[PDB]
């Protein structure tokens with residue numbers, strides 16, 4: 001079958017930290033394709049004058065003609081900050097049963113997994129790949145002890161089947177943050193080379209994140 | 213025409229949480245002026261030995277020399293308190309036909325709006341801006357479902373014309389409350405830097421909220 | 425065997441609201457003994473100049489001469505703070521096999537149960553009695569949906585055996601809070617008739633909660 | 637003898653988070669004097685166009701007319717950076733041997749104490765008061781487990797003598813950061829009510845933190 005990744009994020013904006021992390025994990029997992037999955041949030045949770053539509057277009061600009069990288073907009077086509085399990089169920093019915101699904105998770109996010117909705121059917125539909133980094137600790141709550149026990153494999157190449165396991169991977173992400181880029185733009189400064197050149201171009205063309 | 217804001221509340225006392233939220237909304241909506249609106253209440257629900265007129269002075273001290281901020285005392289210059297809609301009509305008679313008016317209110321205060329007088333006419337005279345924050349839900353009563361349906365606009369910069377629409381905004385206000393502040397002052401402790409300096413000195417000079 | 429309740433809390437200080445709830449629980453459940461369980465916390469989270477041993481002293485004063493009601497200081501002694509499940513295994517180590525143990529917890533405290541350490545093991549040792557009250561929600565975390573549909577008993581007299589089940593009880597506690605009681609005492613005011621009489625004398629005789 | 641606090645910070649700028657902290661600490665500790673001590677750093681480590689002098693000017697504005705709160709410029713009056721043990725040795729020289737010195741450190745900084753220069757020397761000259769607050773954590777390095785075993789006291793009132801012990805104090809600091817203020821300023825936004833009013837005045841007077 002195919003090997004599909006899912007990379008979820010707010011992407012406000014998408015930057016080279018995200019993009020370098022998606023290139024790397026596609027290569028480490030030999031994915032057919034890695035889908036960036038821009039997250040839904042309440043409209044008043046959006047950066048003022050940056051719509052969920054423009055977060056979407058910037059990711060689109062980001063993956064434009066990039067090998068093995070796509071954008072899944074399906075959470076933004078819903079109605080509210082839906083559930084990842086809904087997204088997992090929806091992607092699944094579009095895949096073959098032998099296709100394998102990998103959902104990229106940052107360590108800090110994974111440590112709150114039992115605070116997600118129906119969090120125990122997640123692995124029913126995919127494998128979870130948890131992003132280890134310089135910063136984000138690596139000792140989970142007891143709440144996750146038995147999950148790691150029943151489901152983790154230490155070799156990311158070890159993952160078998162369409163879904164069901166958890167592995168860990170290591171990246172050294174460039175130290176680039178959406179918050180820092182928003183601050184620079186607000187001060188009329190250049191975020192050139194902090195973001196993909198096509199995303200830069202979109203941000204400048206549409207004059208995004210500009211000081212009130 | 214001008215963009216006019218209304219920000220209601222008891223202000224017992226006015227403090228930085230109130231004031232930072234004003235600054236922020238007057239900025240977010242590019243207002244010409246934001247009016248702090250001290251509300252009237254029965255004399256017996258005043259804090260003992262802090263009057264309706266001293267609540268007013270403290271808000272005056274708070275906006276003295278601040279840009280875009282003023283005080284409308286109109287609800288305190290009446291028999292007893294009244295209803296918001298009357299204030300709306302009164303403000304809207306001193307206003308130009310195309311002046312835009314924005315009444316800021318909290319989320320929980322928002323959910324109780326069907327229990328306000330002539331609540332369906334409120335929006336005849338202003339747009340309503342609703343303050344969302346952490347630890348103030350976002351699941352309105354059924355009794356408001358048709359209202360949001362007829363009037364909500366996602367994009368707070370999309371409010372059009374003099375009034376008639378509702379939109380939601382996000383703030384994370386300082387962790388500061390009047391209740392907390394009255395308690396401190398009761399214990400003779402300093403509330404400096406919980407309130408504007410002006411207000412601090414008014415409270416200290418008139419020995420407000422002292423233990424009786 | 426015996427019917428024995430546990431009622432945890434910080435009790436800073438124990439007051440009339442807490443003690444009435446105890447009295448009502450013990451009656452209801454026909455308890456042989458109800459143990460007020462003051463909880464441990466780091467020394468830095470205590471109220472200034474009111475120590476753990478003083479919290480326990482007040483609780484002893486509140487139950488002195490009140491048959492059926494007693495104090496358990498076990499979570500206090502132990503060098504550093506406590507996990508409920510450990511408190512339960514120790515209580516159980518002293519209790520005959522057929523003793524019935526009832527742990528009383530508030531609603532909000534209840535929904536957060538999936539955060540407690542080894543939360544799925546708590547009911548190995550006791551029944552859990554949930555205190556439902558006005559101004560206390562009626563919608564719990566999805567995390568608990570299994571547990572409730574697994575272990576709920578609608579009728580409190582239907583708890584059977586030493587433990588294993590949960591049930592919900594209604595009460596309308598007195599409009600008193602230790603936060604308010606601490607602020608009154610900081611102002612030099614009286615809190616007589618908000619705390620039990622013997623608690624009032626202790627507070628006054630040791631000048632607890634006064635202004636620094 | 638006197639009771640005197642030292643509160644070191646970078647203060648870039650001093651904001652209402654720092655000042656509320658200093659007010660609560662003086663109160664708590666019954667300090668005759670709390671001296672804010674701005675940190676020296678190399679020139680290329682300053683904020684562009686905001687000089688150490690100007691960091692010191694803002695702290696002076698912040699404490700003006702606040703009795704008991706003062707500033708100590710002596711680390712700036714020295715060449716390249718000071719080591720805090722040198723800072724305390726020089727303070728001490730000036731005080732009565734029986735004056736008590738309290739040095740306020742936030743939990744995260746204290747956690748790296750064994751890295752500071754001649755770290756085991758500091759308590760010769762003062763008490764260390766380590767502030768805990770909602771965000772760091774409660775777990776230390778091995779490297780501090782014995783200093784803590786040897787030198788701490790659970791009660792701040794427990795601090796005895798001119799120096800020698802370590803204690804821990806709780807506060808809920810307002811969620812203000814100098815990073816967030818610098819970005820807002822760089823964007824032409826107001827930081828009114830996020831900084832003390834006399835600091836706001838100085839910032840605007842001198843157009844500090846203004847975009848290039």
Ligand SMILES: O=C(O)c1ccc[n+]([C@@H]2O[C@H](COP(=O)([O-])O)[C@@H](O)[C@H]2O)c1
Pocket residue numbers: 008009010039082083084085108109115116117118
């Ligand atoms: O499925 C849910 O119940 C679930 C609930 C919370 C987290 N999520 C998703 O995971 C994301 C986690 O990113 P973050 O920045 O909150 O760590 C969050 O932004 C959502 O897309 C999903």
Ligand SMILES: O=C(O)c1ccc[n+]([C@@H]2O[C@H](COP(=O)([O-])O)[C@@H](O)[C@H]2O)c1
Pocket residue numbers: 220221222251294295296297321327328329
């Ligand atoms: O005009 C109404 O009927 C009206 C009814 C409820 C409350 N208000 C507004 O909502 C605020 C909330 O405070 P309260 O005590 O009136 O609920 C009150 O201070 C006014 O701002 C106004």
Ligand SMILES: O=C(O)c1ccc[n+]([C@@H]2O[C@H](COP(=O)([O-])O)[C@@H](O)[C@H]2O)c1
Pocket residue numbers: 432433434463464506507508509533539540541
């Ligand atoms: O056992 C835990 O994991 C635990 C975590 C939270 C609350 N409980 C109990 O209920 C008390 C409530 O206070 P708190 O801050 O722990 O929520 C606490 O003092 C504990 O005895 C216990």
Ligand SMILES: O=C(O)c1ccc[n+]([C@@H]2O[C@H](COP(=O)([O-])O)[C@@H](O)[C@H]2O)c1
Pocket residue numbers: 644645675676718719720721745751752753754
């Ligand atoms: O004495 C040292 O070795 C020394 C080295 C590290 C930190 N300190 C103190 O901590 C200050 C700030 O460093 P930090 O950890 O808060 O980023 C520094 O400016 C001094 O107040 C002092």
